Amino acid sequence: MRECISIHVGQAGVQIGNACWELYCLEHGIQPDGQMPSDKTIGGGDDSFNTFFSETGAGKHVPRAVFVDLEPTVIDEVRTGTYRQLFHPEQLITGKEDAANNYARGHYTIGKEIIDLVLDRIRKLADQCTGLQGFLVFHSFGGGTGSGFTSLLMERLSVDYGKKSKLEFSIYPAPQVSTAVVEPYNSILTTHTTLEHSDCAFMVDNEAIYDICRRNLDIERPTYTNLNRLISQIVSSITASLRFDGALNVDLTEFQTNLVPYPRIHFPLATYAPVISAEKAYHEQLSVAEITNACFEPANQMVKCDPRHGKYMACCLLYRGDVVPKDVNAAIATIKTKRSIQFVDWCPTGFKVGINYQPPTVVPGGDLAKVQRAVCMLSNTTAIAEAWARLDHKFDLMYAKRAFVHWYVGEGMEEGEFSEAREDMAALEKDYEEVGVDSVE
Amino acid sequence: NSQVTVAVRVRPFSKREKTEKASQVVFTNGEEITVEHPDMKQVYSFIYDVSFWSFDECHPGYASQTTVYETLAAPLLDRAFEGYNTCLFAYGQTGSGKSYTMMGLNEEPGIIPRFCEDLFAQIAKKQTSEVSYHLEMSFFEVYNEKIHDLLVCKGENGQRKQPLRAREHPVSGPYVEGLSMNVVSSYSDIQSWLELGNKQRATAATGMNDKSSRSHSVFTLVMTQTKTEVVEGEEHDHRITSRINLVDLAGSERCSTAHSSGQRLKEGVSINKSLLTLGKVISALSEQANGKRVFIPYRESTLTWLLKESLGGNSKTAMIATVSPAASNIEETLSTLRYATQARLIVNIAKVNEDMNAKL
Amino acid sequence: MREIVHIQAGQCGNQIGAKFWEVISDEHGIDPTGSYHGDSDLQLERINVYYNEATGNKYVPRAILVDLEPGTMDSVRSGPFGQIFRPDNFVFGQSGAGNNWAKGHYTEGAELVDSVLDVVRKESESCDCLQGFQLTHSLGGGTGSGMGTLLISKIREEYPDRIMNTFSVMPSPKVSDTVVEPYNATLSVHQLVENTDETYCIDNEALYDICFRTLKLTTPTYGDLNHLVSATMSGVTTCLRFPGQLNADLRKLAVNMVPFPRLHFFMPGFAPLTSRGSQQYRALTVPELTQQMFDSKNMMAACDPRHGRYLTVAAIFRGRMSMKEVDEQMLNVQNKNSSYFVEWIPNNVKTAVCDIPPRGLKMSATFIGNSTAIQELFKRISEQFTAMFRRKAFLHWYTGEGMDEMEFTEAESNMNDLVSEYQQYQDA
Ligand SMILES: CC(=O)O[C@H]1C(=O)[C@@]2(C)[C@H]([C@H](OC(=O)c3ccccc3)[C@]3(O)C[C@H](OC(=O)[C@H](O)[C@@H](NC(=O)c4ccccc4)c4ccccc4)C(C)=C1C3(C)C)[C@]1(OC(C)=O)CO[C@@H]1C[C@@H]2O
Ligand SMILES: Nc1nc2c(ncn2[C@@H]2O[C@H](COP(=O)(O)OP(=O)(O)OP(=O)(O)O)[C@@H](O)[C@H]2O)c(=O)[nH]1
Ligand SMILES: Nc1nc2c(ncn2[C@@H]2O[C@H](COP(=O)(O)OP(=O)(O)O)[C@@H](O)[C@H]2O)c(=O)[nH]1
Ligand SMILES: [Mg+2]
């Protein structure tokens, strides 16, 4: 049956996964202690689905996910935390030293003798299921553990497993904000190595969610939990198709097709429309027109990239809850009726739709509110060239003085490698400005 | 003055290669240089000041070793007589035949023996009773940031290295402490010494090829010029000194492919650091050329630091790089050009200067 | 699972360690017997970073001492926390160098260095995986400089893959507690810019002015001036000993902050430092710390930073916080004061955060920074140096141990050259 391996890496991926599973478990009716009071009381139902949750004869459920690092301060937080007696204690640590936020230690000096354990567990998980294997790998640019290890793993899984769907809910570098001074390098190299193997690679950012949380929810003092729950609800808004049942479902092989025209252009964005608190949950209708208009607002985006200076090459919408599809079609028509938006000439269709019957849910202690519907948007657009044109300009400066390098060459790298990626990235920029030209006859 | 003058060469196919029909890729349009990835996706373009050609023996503008010497070496031999130190570099990965360009063979001699022979010739032209010329030699290497000697033998016990130091006199710059210096008059003699040096060089076979290098190699030739004879009594109030430094360098050595940990990896790391710092030094010299004042990171490496008087100041330099045209070896080849992109010394630069109003 | 060693030379290093172990023991729940009387399990999950274990749940540290005179030894042992240390680790000799660098790099240290390394190897091999080494050594004077530099050289010939780090006091302009500071200090920098990954300059004058102005203390003492250095040291590894929403380590702070390797001389800083009455008249928020940290007066170098720009800086906050507020304040700092920052680096700040705060506060912070304004310090020493060497003032005590004028001249260049590098970026 349909299944999906999940592979978290780095402090971003694991702090995200501890929310994704907190949500997945609360949806399917599970307690953190493995067992199932819910279906114990129902005496039936597949609801603890075999898509994510493997199942033993003893009633205990074990999820199909692994996660890694080379700094055990995280995984110990799991092993002691609330969720210790759920996951498989093959939580692969080799925490003998970190990656020093360089691509070199993560992809070569401490990327050797360690990767094989991960490949062994991945095979152990695949051979348990005779079904679909769409990968989800949650990493983050900049860091070494989340750039280099990922860059090594994808190029190897493309060799062992070949033609399967591989995805990435990666994190992007904020242009102004940063928690580092090497993100540009560690990002451009990763893009070069993962332009080819991967199929799609979604992208989010840390600044836009900050600005959201100050704007709508009236939150004053965020943390690094509240954002991750929004990432987790996004992921749920996707995976509802594979788990649950409803009108128009979208498997993982569909996202890679509908949204990746050329092999090299597979770097979309993302959005969740309703973001509200217990106070603003009232005082609002929450129709479908309101939502599908909000999805294309500049502010409700999740990367600081003005789309009005760009064009939408393709788009996919995934809804939840009680929905009436003529409202959806009316919304799409109202959208194409507008003029601020500009679709290309070679895609007058553009849109895709997927519907599911389940509502969303709530993580108690959270800012979001109980509702009766919700929506997610994903777009392959062209404004994001700007968010690459800045990065190379954050690159060409430093490399002009061969700075912040001596460590990198010190862990087994050739400097000329930089001078390749700058080209393979620049070519990419040309593509996002080649297609924007409309054809001529 | 600043006289970088980087060059690039293109070898021919081998006999083995022409049997296997190595697909040509690297092309020219004269001075400009182009390359075409066999996917036919993009065309990279590289310019240099000078461009040689040794692929077709019939084409116009053919680069035979006579041309190489007569274009690059002669200014060095000339300037050394004026009393200035000079240096010559060499880049190139294994298989590009640096051995063919520098040393050469008995039927097509390279650079080294030609330079030495012309030095001998001009010596025997200027040799009078008024003027004398003394030539002294030396040879060392660099490996894991240490220094060794090669001319000198060692103890037949084991790996009896030669630990040496680098120190700084306040006048003549840096030197080595413990070094062997020798005297020369015969070209056959320096050939003997050079063989004795190249034998003990630090190397190690790999999966790529047995004959590969892991250590940079300096060949130093000190010249002397004694003329000062006081008209009222023999007296050397001064004598001019001028240095020549040839050096052979190793490759870039990407280590994510040649994954053989231990010492083979811990030596390539230092090698690449040295290459990086040398590149920074030359990129700084190209700006020193333009009258602007800047810093130079001389002390950041070793091979830069035993060259400080010969590289900078009123000193003429050079560099060349052998390559391979066979499309099977594009990756290494690309770096073998991407290191030497100093052709754009000062192009597309902004200017804001206001020091006018020089009047009454 | 990773590790840090501690070496302690001279008088300064020993009297500092005697307060650093006093602060770490107070955070991990330790008592003078070396036993445990903590409250939370969370203090013991990573106690194996600084401390070893023992038979009966006693905990004993990886501390090593050097000094070439026992005048400090009995001062430690006859104290509150001078008895947990391993008596096999209290190395010493006799006949101290007397503030002569030559007597502490050539003659006596040459007798004692192997006896030091015989213990360093024991304390290394007994670890599982190693990270880097720590040290606490003054300059200007003798023992801590000479023997410390020698230890650094021997180690980084032995163990180069790993890290090295020092917390070195420096001389000061107004008053000197030794008449031959410049000479010994220059000779120390000649062998510490090459063989180091980071070193943290501290200056006694800055601590004095701090303790006079902010805390408004009347009867200070060296033992309480050292309380700020222990604080900083503690904060630097708080990313390693504890959890954190955005963890860090030593090597991360090394890569991010050291663009070219030779410029690895820092300028530290701690916050929130306040008086015993004036804590009621303040608030604990991120900006209340951020305005205090980039101030000129909560620094420890005796170097006005606003005479120059900052190549890069860092920060380690501690407490339940809001990262948005942190990153926003750092954005505004890079905005308003661009002239004090560099243009050819786009983001001259990073961050690092831990969620397990100190014993008595709800919030704390350390600040680290690689500034150009250290330039004016070295301009002094060379100046102070060269006029003395123009006349060979105190030379013969140094030539009387098998040395040469050459060894000084080199060092001078290696400082002046370094100075020039900084000036390359002092202008726009
Ligand atoms: C009861 C109480 O909370 O009073 C505070 C206090 O008044 C202040 C002034 C403390 C006090 O600090 C000083 O007395 C002091 C004076 C001059 C120079 C250095 C220290 C305090 O003594 C210091 C002490 O700080 C700590 O406990 C930290 O854990 C500190 N460790 C120790 O002080 C300590 C040292 C030896 C043995 C046991 C504990 C520390 C700081 C950073 C990292 C690790 C540990 C505390 C809370 C206070 C007193 C006790 C008054 C302050 O301490 C520090 C370094 O942050 C001085 O400024 C803070 C702000 C506090 O308000
Ligand atoms: N959204 C989100 N991002 C996080 C979180 N924690 C860390 N990050 C991101 O992590 C990035 C820092 O580099 P990382 O990807 O964390 O690298 P790492 O996990 O430390 O792994 P190493 O670099 O090897 O140490 C920053 O861009 C942060 O935004 C989190 O909890 N939520
Ligand atoms: N901050 C601080 N510095 C000290 C202390 N004791 C000594 N020093 C410094 O240490 C230097 C003396 O050098 P010293 O270590 O005695 O040389 P040694 O005798 O060879 O060990 C002086 O410059 C002081 O500034 C102290 O208790 N606190
Ligand atoms: Mg990490």
Author numbering:
A (entry chain A): 1 to 441
B (entry chain K): 391 to 750
C (entry chain B): 1 to 428
Paper text:
Construct K755 includes the neck-linker and part of the first coiled coil heptad repeat of the CC1 domain. The structure of the core motor domain of the MT- K755 and MT-K772 complexes in the Apo and ADP states conform to the open configuration, as it is also the case for the complexes with the shorter KIF14 constructs. However, different from the MT-K743-ADP/Apo and MT-K748-ADP/Apo maps, the MT-K755-ADP/Apo and the MT-K772-ADP/Apo maps show a neck-linker associated density going sideways reaching the motor domain of an adjacent protofilament. In this state, one head is bound to the microtubule with the nucleotide-binding pocket in the open configuration and the other is tethered and presumably in a semi-closed configuration similar to the microtubule-unbound KIF14-ADP crystal structure (K-ADP_4OZQ). The tethered motor domain remains mobile (disordered) and the dimer adopts a one-head-bound conformation similar to the MT-K755-Apo/ADP and MT-K772-Apo/ADP structures. The conformation of the neck-linker in the K772 and K755 Apo/ADP structures suggests that the tethered head is positioned sideways and toward the microtubule plus end (the direction of movement) relative to the trailing position seen in the two-head microtubule-bound intermediate (step 2).
KIF14 is a microtubule-based motor protein with essential roles during cell division. KIF14 belongs to the kinesin-3 family of motor proteins. As all kinesins, KIF14 possesses a highly conserved catalytic motor or head domain that contains nucleotide and microtubule binding sites, and where ATP hydrolysis is coupled to the generation of mechanical work.
